[PDB]
Amino acid sequence: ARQGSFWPVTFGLACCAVEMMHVSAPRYDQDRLGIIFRASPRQSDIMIVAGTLTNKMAPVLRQVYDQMPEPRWVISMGSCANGGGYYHFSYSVVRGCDRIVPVDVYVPGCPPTSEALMYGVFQLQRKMRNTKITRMWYRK
Amino acid sequence: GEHALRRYPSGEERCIACKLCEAICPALAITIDAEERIDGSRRTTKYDIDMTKCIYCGYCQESCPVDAIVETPNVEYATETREELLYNKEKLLANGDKWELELQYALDADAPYR
Amino acid sequence: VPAHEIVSGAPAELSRNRVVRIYQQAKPATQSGEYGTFAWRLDWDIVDVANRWENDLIGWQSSGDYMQATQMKFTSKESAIKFANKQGWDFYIQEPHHRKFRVKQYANNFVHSYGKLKHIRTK
Amino acid sequence: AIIATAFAETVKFSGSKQELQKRTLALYRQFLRGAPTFADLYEVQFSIPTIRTKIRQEFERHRFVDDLSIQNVLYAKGHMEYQECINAWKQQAQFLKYFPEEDDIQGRHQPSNFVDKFLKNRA
Amino acid sequence: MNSFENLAQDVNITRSGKTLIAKGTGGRSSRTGYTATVFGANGFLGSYLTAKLAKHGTTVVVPYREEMAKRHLKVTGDLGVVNFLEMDLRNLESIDEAVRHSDIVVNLIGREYETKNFNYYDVHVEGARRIAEAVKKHNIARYIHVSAFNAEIDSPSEFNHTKGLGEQVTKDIVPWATIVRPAPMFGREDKWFLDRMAFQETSNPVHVIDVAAALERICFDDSTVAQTFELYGPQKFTQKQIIDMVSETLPKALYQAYTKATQAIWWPTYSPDQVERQFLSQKIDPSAKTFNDLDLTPMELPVSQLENKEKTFVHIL
Amino acid sequence: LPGGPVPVFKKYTVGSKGIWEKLRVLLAIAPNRSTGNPIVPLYRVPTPGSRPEANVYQDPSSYPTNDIAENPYWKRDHRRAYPQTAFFDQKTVTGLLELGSEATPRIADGEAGTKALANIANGGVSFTQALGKSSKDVIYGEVLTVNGLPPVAPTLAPKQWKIIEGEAAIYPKGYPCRTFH
Amino acid sequence: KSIISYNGNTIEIPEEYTKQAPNRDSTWAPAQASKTEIYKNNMVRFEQKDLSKQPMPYAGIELIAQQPVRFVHGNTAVCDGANHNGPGAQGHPKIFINVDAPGSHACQYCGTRYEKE
Amino acid sequence: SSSLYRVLRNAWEVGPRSYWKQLNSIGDTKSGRLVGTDIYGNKFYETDHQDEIHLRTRYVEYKEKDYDMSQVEPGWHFWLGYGVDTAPCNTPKEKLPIRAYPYKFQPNYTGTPGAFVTYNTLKPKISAWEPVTKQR
Amino acid sequence: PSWENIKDIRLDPKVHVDEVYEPIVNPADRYLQHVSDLHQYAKYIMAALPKYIQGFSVWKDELTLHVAPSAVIPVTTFLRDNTSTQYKSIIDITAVDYPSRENRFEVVYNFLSVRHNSRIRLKTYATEVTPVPSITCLYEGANWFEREAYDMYGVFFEGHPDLRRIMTDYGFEGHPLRKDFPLTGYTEVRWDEEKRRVVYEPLELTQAFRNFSAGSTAWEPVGPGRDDRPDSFKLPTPK
Amino acid sequence: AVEKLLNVEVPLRGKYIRTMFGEITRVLNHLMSVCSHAMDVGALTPFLWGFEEREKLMEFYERVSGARLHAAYVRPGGVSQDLPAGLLDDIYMWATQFGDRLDEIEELLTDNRIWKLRTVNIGTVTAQDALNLGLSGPMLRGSGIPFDIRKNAPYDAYDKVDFDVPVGMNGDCYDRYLIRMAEFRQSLRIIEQCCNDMPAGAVKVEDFKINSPPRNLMKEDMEALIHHFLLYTKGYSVPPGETYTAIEAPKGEMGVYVVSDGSERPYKCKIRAPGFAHLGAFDHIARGHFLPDAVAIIGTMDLVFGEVDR
């Protein structure tokens, strides 16, 4: 259920957002995977930091991450979203959302190809395969 | 997509440590240290790319006279830690090993146009 | 001299602990060009703990000093001094060193030896 | 943008020192009137007289400045700061920039002497 | 700029013989040189402890049990500082492997309630047995063992009994263990405290950031070896006193029968030896060293005019 | 009408075949509309890494540049033949008003014309004094237009517009947008 | 293979992983950092990890030493290092090697040794 | 096409065994030609059928039930994405690159404990002194 | 009439040249006549406002009026309102610091006359402390531009409603586009777990910034170049 | 801007090829923003049809450059490299069907009465304050003023290509919509005229002191290896000067003001974004509108926010 329904709150603030809107395009469809953008963190399972993170928006990104319900993951789309990127040596930039949010999958690419973002989604669903929420309660 | 350090026919590292890919890189992702090895040949001791600050402009591939580093069309290498995403010399030599059959196909169609 | 260091936004640490140097860049012994030897550079002296250290991980040169890559160009020496004490900075200034003019002739190379030759030219 | 923000002021530069002293005291009154809405607005740990002692301390930083233009640039920066703080645009993480001292004790081993500055070479 | 406040100096040698040159200024991107293993870093104390530990660049090795929770400690350190590795307390090679490169090591493994796989005797005196076996084996300077307050063996309380048993075990095995007894612990969203609620026992609550601070202040000076410390707040409190402070800020046998009924669930039910600990109160060792040993003092637990101004506004446009 | 409606068999899109096309010409809005999907044997065959044109490619060139023998580079360099900004203060415009121009020299006495240059180079004259001293047909010759009018703000290539309003327009009449050409 | 872990601890790795490559055991540069050096420095993070799926990509200093030496009859030896099945300019820039001294003179781009005979 | 006739005739051509595995793998029904297989083991197919859209002609049937785009061999990976026409068993002796070492193909080990570790390729830049004492 | 029977265009006789012929010519030669026109126009404008126009520069198809700060509102008014000028649209205004000058910043103004299809530039100067007067009195689109020139450079615009910072952090102390401000800045951001907020710390990098500007040319790369000043607008040589 | 400072001229084929890839960029931009405006108003099928045409065009980008979204193709000397072997025959095959794929999107919006009523007197700007706010492109031509740069101050082989320009009459969101729906058509006219009139020749500028020699040459020529080595370590030097160069982006007039020291680094660069002046103009227009019509006016100034802050 956590895989076949898969709802991507997006905090992407630059260019990688259009590359995400190619995952909504009719060539690389996402709804055929079960993906839909519930555009409120109160109902999204996961977050996608798809774009840069400036120093003006790091508490805003944290406050959006705070509100989601507890079975929550986050994938980091792009190279500006992991380790600063192109804007790594800048005064107003966070060097990746690793400092703000605890991220599970990193999708690299400065425009990380819609191919590759979908592949990062499949990697996250594989991480959902072996989460073992009920075996863990058995103290494996 | 991702990066690869190619090799010659009969296996030689191709990277003559000319620092051109480091000098041109618009996001300062390349770092290289270079030493003369035992043969007297000029090679890199240390080659490194930060893939978190790489921007995929292809200038590092355009700049190399030997054509030692290239871009393989792999985009499916998404990771889970930042440490995995820092590629030293060994990961890039393993990439140029793995993708070499494919990079033949890429550079058979690209090399006149370059 | 008006004191602009309180309205620049720079911290007090930079104006009270860091000494800076005005210098004109030396003509390189490598090549015969002299183009980068006209502007007066402004450059910060290094901090000995904060300058550079090698990383745990890969061996990246990490630094906590942030003025290590900043360097200014000025047209004049008095321009650099006026800007440097206008921003409230401790500076040292380095005087340039030009070459002594010596007259050269090509006919110097083969003048007549009256006594011992004491030299053999090659050309 | 013909209509301006609520707590705006057309930026205007004073030729007299005393009318700028008038504007400075009016600004201090605005800050200290707004200290309780700053305490409610930014969800702070402590109580209102610490906001008030910080406003007074940030004004006693800049008391013996002589030059009238530098005091004009200082007054304009201060009114911009008031307008950001009162309009709830700054967030709590940047409101608490003003209080680096208060949040926590940063640890042991505060270097005071030359030697405990020397043992960690100023770290 | 930043500065190493946890360190007395730059160049620190450990007692095992390792030379440690700290690099750079203080802060995130620099390194102190120590390698630390915090057991139970998932825990309520351990999150703050390795937040304070990885703040300056101490390499922290954390052995985790579940991997879904541990993600919130990746944010705390630099890239390459915190190192997660999986551990069960049963597989003894995971225990002697997580402590293999530590030069300091901290245990906090202690559980409120017995469950199907663990009573209090295997979590508190035998897990501590196995960890101190490993530190015995591996020549680790500065073994630190955290316990409970009221930790004595003549106690009727099985928790307090086996925790005194646990320190018996870690004084048995390693002579140079520092051993630390904190008071009740108040902090942000603690498990059986402020959010559980927001009585004639008397015990001191201590803030957890200052038990973590005090713990780290133990961690780096070696004045602290083979001494046991008790960490108690400033003023002595009644439970009815505490909860009525909380109130203006915002039969025993069938009660035990009720907790019998409610334990057979996946949510963290109340332990029956916990009402037992309620009648017990804070009797602290006078021949121990408290907060003022390590230079800190702990934080203590403690209509008519708007109608007429409304008369000038507009309400219906 | 040169770019007007073309039928859908010149549009390179998979379309339809059989009596299903006879059904969809009755069930349509415009019958000359494609389906969107490109023709697979036509659109992108051969694939770009497999082209016979790649093995014959040579780098292109123009003749007076690739020429091996007759051009030197200094004749066809234009980066080092840049013009500079003609910076004019007010006293050189006073000099242009009082001494003259290289097209229009009002200077005799070359030996004394250097010292006549000199005091304006020192700041002897001022500019409104030069405007008062100067003739009316030098004011109407060099400062103003020869008819006495102010010069209009110059443009490089003037654009004369021509509104297309017939059925060569892009919207018929009744729509609030017009073709301007 | 046991190496001392800065404390008197000896940690044990298989000896197939203390080689620089499966071609050559020793190091080919004065600052090449031995595998015993690397594993002595940071094994805090090779814990719980397979040494098998590390790269191991085949040092070229001995893959160039087993190539035969070419023989030229003239005075100077031409080299580009291109392939001649590939449509384009691959290989290195074309350099000319003097072969006059006793021994084999190597190309400074590719390492193929040339000898006059 | 989006037809029922297409899924109908493809289900009849491929057979019910292969239909249930292609239904447990993809949503579509596809009739291929078996151009070749992978060194990892991944059968590839090319469809010549007339009612196909662009970018549907070529596909992979994997081996494992957890499949990756990462599990395809490099020379085949360029082919699946429509880079080359000729499959890497179809290309002649001249295109196959000369090597002096074996090929081993690691796909991707992300989350797997065989994930990559980065480290310093060289030794620390400034040496320290070996302690040597002397009795005077 | 089918998509089966449609012709291919890959099988076609294509264009083929033996050899391409492109004549070489200086790109600055196409401007010259208009550049002469521009010269005359500027010589008029300085003659029309002698109290306010210190200079002008014509490079190549681009006019720049050099005007003092207390002289900016009488000039812009003229440029908005004279029938010959009609520079209605504000385009882009900003600052550039030259730290070697007494007056550190110069403030440039770009205007477009959509009537006459022409652009103009207006340059004034400002020290770090002394202002420039604001043209938001005349142009309602100017103020955001002035405001950006405020935050990146610290230049003031007296008589400006809501001068404050824009496109920078709210508690940011410093003016970024300024030669004394370093590239990576002074501070950095992380999440403190103890305080449960982001904290702002003094800056520290895992890889230090390496500028390769050290290592520029030692030979001066371009000449002085030629002039395209017309013979109408340079001083006569005597005799 | 760097061409104007460098005083060099791009070849003929390099001009036509940047006309063509600046017009399919215009198609992609108008596609994305018209369908994004239709989505935030409430029509959601044009979003997906336009994004399929965007996939059809992003492949042309990936053929031409390497990457799909960010292409470093247009360079200060000219063009990065030559076209691939069979792309000119492919853009034609695309255009033949895009002509009707656009009329189809036009039908459920242009005379939709809900789409009409939502944008008829929304976002009205008068022609006199469209100049005072500094508005340009589709917002200035929404108000009746006949001005666009590729006709008025032409560049990059727009002289050689014949097309017309749509200009609205009332200053509203509806005429700003109609002129985009017509600029689609005009861009398609450019594309077929540029595929018909494509010449042969060099694609980069002629000399190797501002852009690199080809790899055929620098591996055998000593001069070309010297130039290749120096253009990548140091770069070329630009003569000292200043320029403001403005072209017409599909958002509006976009300019760059660059100050050249004479070094190989720019002394100063400034981007004048169209959307900065469009969002600065928001208060002047959105006074007295309802809250839903504050959303349809964002989708006519078309804020991508890479423009507004940088």
Ligand SMILES: NC(=O)C1=CN([C@@H]2O[C@H](COP(=O)(O)OP(=O)(O)OC[C@H]3O[C@@H](n4cnc5c(N)ncnc54)[C@H](OP(=O)(O)O)[C@@H]3O)[C@@H](O)[C@H]2O)C=CC1
């Ligand atoms: N009132 C209080 O809070 C007091 C606490 N203490 C003691 O401090 C220590 C930590 O307290 P606190 O932080 O507040 O509460 P915790 O929730 O942290 O206690 C449990 C911690 O240890 C882990 N744990 C428990 N059992 C096991 C087990 N068999 N195997 C592996 N890990 C286990 C838990 O893992 P996981 O995170 O996955 O659940 C968790 O990290 C305990 O020893 C406690 O006795 C001292 C006095 C009073």
Ligand code: SF4
């Ligand atoms: S990751 Fe790349 S494409 Fe995405 S926003 Fe950053 S720079 Fe732009």
Ligand code: SF4
């Ligand atoms: S990869 Fe190329 S550019 Fe980089 S150092 Fe090696 S030869 Fe030089």
Ligand code: SF4
């Ligand atoms: S692709 Fe660009 S950013 Fe990446 S390493 Fe090469 S030159 Fe640097």
Ligand SMILES: [Zn+2]
């Ligand atoms: Zn060679």
